[PDB]
Amino acid sequence: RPTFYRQELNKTIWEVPERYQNLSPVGSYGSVCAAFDTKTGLRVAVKKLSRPFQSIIHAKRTYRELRLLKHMKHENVIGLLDVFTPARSLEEFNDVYLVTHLMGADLNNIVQKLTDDHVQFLIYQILRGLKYIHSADIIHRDLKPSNLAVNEDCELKILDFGVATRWYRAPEIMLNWMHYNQTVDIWSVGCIMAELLTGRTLFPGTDHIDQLKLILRLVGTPGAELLKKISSESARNYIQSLTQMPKMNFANVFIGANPLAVDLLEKMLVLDSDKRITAAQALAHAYFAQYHDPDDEPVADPYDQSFESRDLLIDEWKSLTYDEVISFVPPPLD
Ligand SMILES: Nc1ccc2c(NC3CC3)nc(-c3ccccc3)nc2c1
Ligand SMILES: Nc1ccc2c(NC3CC3)nc(-c3ccccc3)nc2c1
């Protein structure tokens, strides 16, 4: 066990290993401090979870967050440098702190007027991380510029938790489809890419009804092939009742963009999610010609999501979390 030290940071009592020095609050789910990690000489983010075990729901979320972070080992996905608690046993375990690399800024923070070459590289790395995430049978579901961290070097990582979420949300989620799949995240990337190319939010809906309206304006109203797959009578009838909007020609919307970027946008922003390009397929698209390497786009180890279907007591989730803190193995130095 390391020596721990205590301090007050903007209302909170932080108790951290001596390893982490010069804590400096950066934002407040829980709050975050920048720190110097004396073990590596790198700046790190230390996140103290707020009330991690205060309900069955908080408790399972805490476990979920730790399981996910522990799993991610990819250059374009946030990973866990450390997890620790000041507690010496399960019985006094009440606090969890998570340590990750400190990233420069978020993609929202860097959006003024982006060059096509920057767009290629940034979207490439998003798709590379998503390939990896999706290969674990995980759906991010909340991809938006504030959940993407970027270095000054333009290196990007997808974050679990860092502008309205809805603006980036696939139409099938707004419509409450229970069986939406991983291409919801490709929809989101499409929305992000469009925004990077034009400097404007592609769909700034004021709410979900407005959001779908703006969406169908561009992608047009569902064809016969999509309608016959919609299990909800009310939703199909609603969809079918709207004024028929033809799909816009994207060349006439993203005027002057690289035609390859326009073409990839066409394959991402397909209304029918069964026809949307996957992350793995997007990577091989011609737009990423100067970056794509089929031998350096790895997939993830399988991830056991079976706890998701379990209903456990608070102390059991809390105990499973403690087990995960105890079994944590630091990533290799350098
Ligand atoms: N195989 C599929 C493909 C796309 C689907 C989709 N897409 C949303 C219209 C854009 N929506 C729905 C659905 C089902 C119940 C209630 C509301 C929506 N199902 C879909 C099934
Ligand atoms: N007359 C109707 C009948 C059904 C509807 C429905 N059905 C989905 C199963 C919930 N969803 C929506 C809607 C519209 C915009 C954004 C999100 C959802 N509108 C409906 C309007």
Author numbering: 5 to 32, 35 to 117, 120 to 170, 183 to 354
Paper text:
Interestingly, several MAP kinases, cyclin dependant kinases (CDKs) and glycogen synthase kinase 3 (GSK-3) contain a hydrophobic pocket at their C terminus about 30 Å away from the ATP-pocket. Recently, Diskin et al. confirmed the existence of the MAPK insert in p38α using protein X-ray crystallography and proposed that this structural feature may “fine-tune” kinase activity. Structural biology studies of p38α in complex with β-octyl-glucopyranoside revealed flexibility of this region and its ability to accommodate small molecules. Although, as yet no clear biological function can be attributed to this hydrophobic pocket in p38α, potent ligands which specifically bind to this allosteric site may offer a valuable starting point for the development of chemical biology tool compounds for the investigation of its biological function.
